[PDB]
Amino acid sequence: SRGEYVVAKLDDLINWARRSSLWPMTFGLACCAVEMMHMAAPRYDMDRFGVVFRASPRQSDVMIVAGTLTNKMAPALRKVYDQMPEPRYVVSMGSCANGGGYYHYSYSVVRGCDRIVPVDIYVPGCPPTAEALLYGILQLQKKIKREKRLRIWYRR
Amino acid sequence: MFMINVLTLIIPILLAVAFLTLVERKVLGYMQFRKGPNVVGPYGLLQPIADAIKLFIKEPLRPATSSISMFILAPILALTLALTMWIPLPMPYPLINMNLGVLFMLAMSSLAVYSILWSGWASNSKYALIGALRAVAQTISYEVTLAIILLSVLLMNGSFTLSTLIITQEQVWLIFPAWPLAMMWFISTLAETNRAPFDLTEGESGFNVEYAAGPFALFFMAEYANIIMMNIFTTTLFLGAFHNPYMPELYTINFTIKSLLLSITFLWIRASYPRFRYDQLMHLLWKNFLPLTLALCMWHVSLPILLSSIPPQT
Amino acid sequence: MNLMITLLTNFTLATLLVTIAFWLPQLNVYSEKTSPDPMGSARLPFSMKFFLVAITFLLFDLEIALLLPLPWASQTTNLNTMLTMALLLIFLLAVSLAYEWTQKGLEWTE
Amino acid sequence: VKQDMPPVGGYGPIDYKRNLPRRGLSGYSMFAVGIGALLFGYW
Amino acid sequence: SDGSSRPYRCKIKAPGFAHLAGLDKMSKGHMLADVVAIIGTQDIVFGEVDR
Amino acid sequence: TYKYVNLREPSMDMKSVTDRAAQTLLWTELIRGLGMTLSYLFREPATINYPFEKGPLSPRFRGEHALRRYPSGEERCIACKLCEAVCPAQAITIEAEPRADGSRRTTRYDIDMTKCIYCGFCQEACPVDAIVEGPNFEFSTETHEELLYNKEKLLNNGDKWEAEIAANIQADYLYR
Numbered sequence A: 001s002r003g004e005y006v007v008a009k010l011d012d013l014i015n016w017a018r019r020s021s022l023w024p025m026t027f028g029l030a031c032c033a034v035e036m037m038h039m040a041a042p043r044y045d046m047d048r049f050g051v052v053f054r055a056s057p058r059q060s061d062v063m064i065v066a067g068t069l070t071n072k073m074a075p076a077l078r079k080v081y082d083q084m085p086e087p088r089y090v091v092s093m094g095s096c097a098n099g100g101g102y103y104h105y106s107y108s109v110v111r112g113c114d115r116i117v118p119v120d121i122y123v124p125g126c127p128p129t130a131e132a133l134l135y136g137i138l139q140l141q142k143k144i145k146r147e148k149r150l151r152i153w154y155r156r
Numbered sequence B: 001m002f003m004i005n006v007l008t009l010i011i012p013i014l015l016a017v018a019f020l021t022l023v024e025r026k027v028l029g030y031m032q033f034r035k036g037p038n039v040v041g042p043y044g045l046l047q048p049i050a051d052a053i054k055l056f057i058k059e060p061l062r063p064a065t066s067s068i069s070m071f072i073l074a075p076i077l078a079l080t081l082a083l084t085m086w087i088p089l090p091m092p093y094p095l096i097n098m099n100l101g102v103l104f105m106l107a108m109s110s111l112a113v114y115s116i117l118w119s120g121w122a123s124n125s126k127y128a129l130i131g132a133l134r135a136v137a138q139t140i141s142y143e144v145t146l147a148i149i150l151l152s153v154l155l156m157n158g159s160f161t162l163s164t165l166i167i168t169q170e171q172v173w174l175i176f177p178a179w180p181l182a183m184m185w186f187i188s189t190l191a192e193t194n195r196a197p198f199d200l201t202e203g204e205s206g207f208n209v210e211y212a213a214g215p216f217a218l219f220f221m222a223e224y225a226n227i228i229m230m231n232i233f234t235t236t237l238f239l240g241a242f243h244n245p246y247m248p249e250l251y252t253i254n255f256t257i258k259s260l261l262l263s264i265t266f267l268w269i270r271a272s273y274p275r276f277r278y279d280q281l282m283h284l285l286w287k288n289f290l291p292l293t294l295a296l297c298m299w300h301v302s303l304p305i306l307l308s309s310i311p312p313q314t
Numbered sequence C: 001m002n003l004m005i006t007l008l009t010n011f012t013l014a015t016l017l018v019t020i021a022f023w024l025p026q027l028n029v030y031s032e033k034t035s036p037d038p039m040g041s042a043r044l045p046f047s048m049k050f051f052l053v054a055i056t057f058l059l060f061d062l063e064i065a066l067l068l069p070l071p072w073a074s075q076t077t078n079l080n081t082m083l084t085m086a087l088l089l090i091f092l093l094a095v096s097l098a099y100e101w102t103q104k105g106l107e108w109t110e
Numbered sequence D: 001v002k003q004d005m006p007p008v009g010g011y012g013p014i015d016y017k018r019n020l021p022r023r024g025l026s027g028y029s030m031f032a033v034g035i036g037a038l039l040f041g042y043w
Numbered sequence E: 001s002d003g004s005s006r007p008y009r010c011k012i013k014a015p016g017f018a019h020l021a022g023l024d025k026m027s028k029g030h031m032l033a034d035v036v037a038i039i040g041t042q043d044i045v046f047g048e049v050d051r
Numbered sequence F: 001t002y003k004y005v006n007l008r009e010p011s012m013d014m015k016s017v018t019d020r021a022a023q024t025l026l027w028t029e030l031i032r033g034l035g036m037t038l039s040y041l042f043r044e045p046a047t048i049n050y051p052f053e054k055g056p057l058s059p060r061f062r063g064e065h066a067l068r069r070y071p072s073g074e075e076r077c078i079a080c081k082l083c084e085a086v087c088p089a090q091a092i093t094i095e096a097e098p099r100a101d102g103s104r105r106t107t108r109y110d111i112d113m114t115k116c117i118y119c120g121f122c123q124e125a126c127p128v129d130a131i132v133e134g135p136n137f138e139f140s141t142e143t144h145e146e147l148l149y150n151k152e153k154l155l156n157n158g159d160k161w162e163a164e165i166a167a168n169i170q171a172d173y174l175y176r
C-alpha cells in the first residue's frame, strides 16, 4: 500500500544520512591505533567517505577499539561507551580487541572487547592494514544501509 | 513585500553556512595533500544534507541542567544575533539603512558573549564553566581592540553610516592608508569568532559540552554565519568595490568574490599554525596590539587635521 | 517599523529551529539512561586574575564610550581644542595601560 | 650467483643538509614599500 | 637464561619509563599546555612504558 | 663527530637588527608558511580510489590462512604438528588419526583468527608447504564465531585462493 512505500522511502533516506556521515571516535590504545592513523593518511583518506578524523566522544556515531583492552582500562571503556548517543556502533580492530590476540592468556588482559561492549564489525589482523580497516568501515556502512527500523515500527 | 526581502536575506545565509562547512572540509583536504568528501555526492555536493539529517535525528544528551531557561535561551540568542548582524550590510544597498550601522554592529558583537556565558553556566560541569569564563575573557579583551580599530578607521569616513563606506573608497582602497589597522583588524576578527590559532576550546572542555547534537549544530552554524559576516564587514571596510548606481550587480559580484577570498584566507590560516596558549594571546593583545592600536588611533585623529582632509559629516 | 518586523522574523526563525532541534528526537523512544568534569565535587576556585582582566576591560570600555564621538567632533570649528582633548583622552588610556603594565597587573595572563 | 646488490659505481648523490631559500626583500626595502603605500593612500 | 630453550627472565628497560618518571620535575612551574608540550617532547609510547 | 644545533649568536649591527624588527612588524615568516601551504594546495593528492584502486603489495604478504593440496587432489598436511608447536600465540589446535587407507591425516585443524598474530611462523615451519598465509586481507566478519576456522573452512580457503597462492609461492620460493 501507500504507507509501506512511504516508510520504505523514509527508511532509505535516514539510512543514507546515517551511513554517509559516520563520525568516529578512536581509542588510541596500542599498535592498531597507529594503523588507524595510517588509514587517516592522504593515501586512504578516511575523510572523503564522510568519516571525519577524531571526532568528539559526545557526538560520534561509531566507536573504534584499536588495541589491547586491559583490566585497568575496561571500566573506562564502558563509561565512554555509555555516554555515546544512539545510534551507536562499535568496530573491533585487531586481534587484541577481537579475542585477546598475543596476550590472550595474560593475567591482566580482557579476552576480547565483546565481553564489555556489544560489537558489530570484527576486523582481523595484527595489525589489520589500513585497507582492511577501510573495508571494515565500508562493511559497517553496508550494514547500516540494510537496516529496517521504520518498516519494523510500521509492522508492529 | 518586505518579508520577501527578509526571507531572501536569511535563507541564503543558512545555505552559505552549510556549503561553507563543505568548502572548508574540501579545502583543508586539498591543503593536506588529500581529498575532501567526494563519495556522498558529485564532489561531495550532498555532504551537508546528509550531515544535517544525521545531526537532527541524533539522540539528545538530556543533561541535568541547572537552569533549563538559559539552556533554551543560549542558542536562541546565538542564532538571533548571528542573523541580525546582516541587515545594515550594504550589498550595495542595505536591507535596513541605518545612520549608525557600524556602532549597531559593535553593539550586537558585544552582546554576543551572553550565549557563551549562559551555555557555560547551564551545564553542571565546573570545568565547562571555567572554559566558558576563559572564552568570555578572551572575547571581551578582543572587543576592546575591535572598537579602537573601528573608531580609528572611521575617521577617514566621517560618519558611522555603512553606505558612505563605499563612497569613501571610490578613489582607492582603504587598505592603502590603513594597512597596519587592516592587519590588526584581521587578527582581531580572527580571534573574535574563536578561530584558529585562537580556538582554545578545542585544545587541552568546551562551553557547550552538555548541549545536544542539534543545539551544538545550531551553535556551530551561528559561529560560521559570524565568520561570513565578519569577512563581509572587513571587505566593506578595507576593500571597497566599484559601485555603478545603474548596475548594482557589479558591486554584488565584486564584493562577493572579495569576501569569499577572505573567508578562504580564514580557512588557509586555520591549517598553517599551531594554537596559542591563553597567556600568549593575552600577551599578544594587551602588550602588542593595544599600544600600537592606541598610537595609530592618535595618528589617525591628528592626521586629517594636518592634511586639510576632514571627510564631510553628511 | 521594518526593523522590528525583521527582528521578530529572526527571533521566530531561531526559536523555530531550536524547537525542532530539541523536540524531534523527543518523538524517538530510544532508551532510558542512568549515567552514574575531571573534578568530582570540588568548589570553583576563585581567581583574582579573571576578575582583574574583566574590570580592566570594563574601565577601558568606559573610556571607549568617551572616545566614541570623535568622527562627529572633528567637524567643530574649535579644532585645536578638540585635537588637544582627543590626544589627552587617548594619552590617559595609554597611561592607564602603562600603570597596569608596570605594577604586574597583566601577569600570568599577560 | 644473483643477489640484490648496489651497482659498481654506487648510487647518485643524496642530500642531507638544511635548505632554506632566504627569499624576499631587506628590512629597509619592506619598510620603504610600506611607507610609500601609506603616503599614496594619504595623498 | 638457565640453560634450557626458554628464558628464565627477560627484563625490558625502556627510556619512556625514566622520562615519564622525570615528567614531574619537567612540568614544575608551567601551564597545562606546557604540560602537554612536555609530554610531547618526551617520545612516550605506553606500550614500552607499561610493557 | 658532533654538531651544535642552536648555537648561532645573533648579529648586533643595524642591518641585522632592522631585518629582525621588520620581520617582527610585517610578519615575514608567517607569510612564508602561508605561501608554502598554498603551494601544497596546488599539488595532485596522493589519494587512491578504494575499493576501485588497491594499495601495492608483495608476494610475501601475510593475510588469511589456507590449506593447500598436491597437484593430484590429495591434501598436503600430514599432521606433524610443527605449526601448532611453533605458534607463538597457541592459535592452532591439531588432532590426528590414521584414516581409512592408513594415511597420516588430520581429523581436526583449528586456527583461532582472533588469537593469531599473523606472524607467518607456521607457513615457514611446514615441511610440505601445506599451511600458507594467503594474500587475502578483506575478510572482516560481523560475528566473533565466524573467525574460528575449522579444517573445512581452511580447505575451502585453499581451494578458493590456490590460483594466487601457487603463483606467490612460485615467485618467492627461491628466497627461502
Ligand SMILES: CCCCCCCCCCCCCCCCCC(=O)OC[C@H](COP(=O)([O-])OCC[N+](C)(C)C)OC(=O)CCCCCCCCCCCCCCCCC
Binding pocket: B180, B182, B183, B184, B186, B187, B197, B234, B238, B269, B273, B284, B288, B289, B292, D031, D034, F024, F025, F026, F027, F030, F031
Ligand atoms: C585584511 C587584509 C589582510 C590581513 C593579513 C592577512 C594575511 C596574513 C596572516 C598572518 C598570520 C595570521 C596568524 C597568526 C596571528 C597571530 C600572530 C600575530 O599576528 O602576531 C602579531 C605580532 C606580535 O608581536 P610579537 O609578539 O612578535 O612581539 C614581540 C614582543 N615581545 C618581545 C614582548 C615578546 O606583531 C604585532 O603585533 C605587530 C602588528 C602590526 C604592526 C604594524 C606596524 C606598521 C609600521 C609602523 C611603522 C614602523 C617604522 C618605525 C616608525 C616610523 C615612524 C615614521
Ligand SMILES: CCCCCCCCCCCCCCCCCC(=O)OC[C@H](COP(=O)(O)OCCN)OC(=O)CCCCCCCCCCCCCCCCC
Binding pocket: B015, B041, B042, B045, B046
Ligand atoms: C543554491 C543552490 C543549492 C544547491 C544545493 C544542492 C547541490 C547538489 C545538487 C545535486 C547534485 C547531484 C545529486 C545526485 C544524487 C543521486 C541521483 C541519482 O541518480 O540517484 C539514484 C538513486 C538510486 O536510483 P535507482 O532507481 O535505485 O537506480 C537503479 C537504476 N539503475 O536514487 C535515489 O537515491 C533516490 C532519488 C534521489 C534524487 C536526488 C536528487 C538530488 C537532490 C538534491 C537536493 C538539493 C537540491 C537543491 C535545493 C536548493 C535549490 C532549489
Ligand SMILES: CCCCCCCCCCCCCCCCCC(=O)OC[C@H](COP(=O)(O)OCCN)OC(=O)CCCCCCCCCCCCCCCCC
Binding pocket: A006, A009, A010, A012, A013, A016, B039, B040, B046, B048, B049, B050, B052, B053
Ligand atoms: C511520500 C514519498 C516520499 C517520502 C519521504 C522521502 C523523501 C525523499 C528522500 C530521499 C529519496 C529517497 C531515497 C534515498 C536513497 C536511496 C537509494 C540509495 O541508497 O542510493 C545510494 C546512492 C549512492 O550509493 P552508495 O551506496 O552510497 O554507493 C557509494 C558508491 N560506491 O545514493 C545517491 O546516489 C544519492 C542519494 C541522495 C538522496 C536524496 C538527496 C538527499 C535528501 C534530500 C531531501 C531531504 C533533505 C532536504 C534538505 C534538508 C536540509 C539539509
Ligand SMILES: CCCCCCCCCCCCCCCCCC(=O)OC[C@H](COP(=O)(O)OCCN)OC(=O)CCCCCCCCCCCCCCCCC
Binding pocket: B073, B076, B077, B080, B081, B084, B097, B098, B099, B100, B101, B104, C001, C003, C004, C007, C011
Ligand atoms: C532573552 C530575551 C530574548 C533574546 C533574543 C532577542 C533579543 C536580542 C537580539 C536582538 C537585539 C535587537 C536590538 C534592537 C535595537 C538596535 C538599535 C536600533 O534599533 O538601531 C537601528 C535604528 C537606529 O539607527 P538610525 O539609522 O539612527 O535610525 C533611523 C533614523 N532615520 O533604530 C531604529 O530604527 C528604531 C526603530 C524603533 C524602535 C525599535 C525598538 C525595538 C524593540 C525594543 C528592543 C528589543 C530587544 C529587547 C531584548 C534585548 C535583549 C534581552
Ligand SMILES: CCCCCCCCCCC1=C(C)C(=O)C(OC)=C(OC)C1=O
Binding pocket: B014, B017, B018, B021, B022, B025, B047, B048, B051, B052, B055, B216, B217, B220, B221
Ligand atoms: C537549517 C539547518 C541547516 C543545517 C545545519 C548546519 C549545517 C550542518 C553542519 C554539520 C557539520 C559539518 C558538516 C561538519 O563537517 C562539522 O565538522 C567540522 C561539524 O561540526 C562538528 C558540523 O556540525
Ligand code: SF4
Binding pocket: A030, A031, A032, A066, A067, A068, A093, A094, A095, A096, A097, A101, A102, A125, A126, A127, A128, F117
Ligand atoms: S592486534 Fe597486534 S598490532 Fe593490534 S594492538 Fe594487538 S599486538 Fe598490536
Ligand code: SF4
Binding pocket: F083, F086, F087, F088, F089, F090, F091, F092, F111, F115, F116, F117, F118, F119, F120, F121, F122, F123
Ligand atoms: S601466523 Fe604465527 S600466530 Fe598466526 S597461526 Fe601462524 S604461527 Fe600462529
Ligand code: SF4
Binding pocket: F076, F077, F078, F079, F080, F081, F082, F083, F084, F094, F122, F125, F126, F127, F128, F129, F130, F131
Ligand atoms: S606444519 Fe604443515 S604438515 Fe605439519 S601439522 Fe602443520 S600444516 Fe600439517
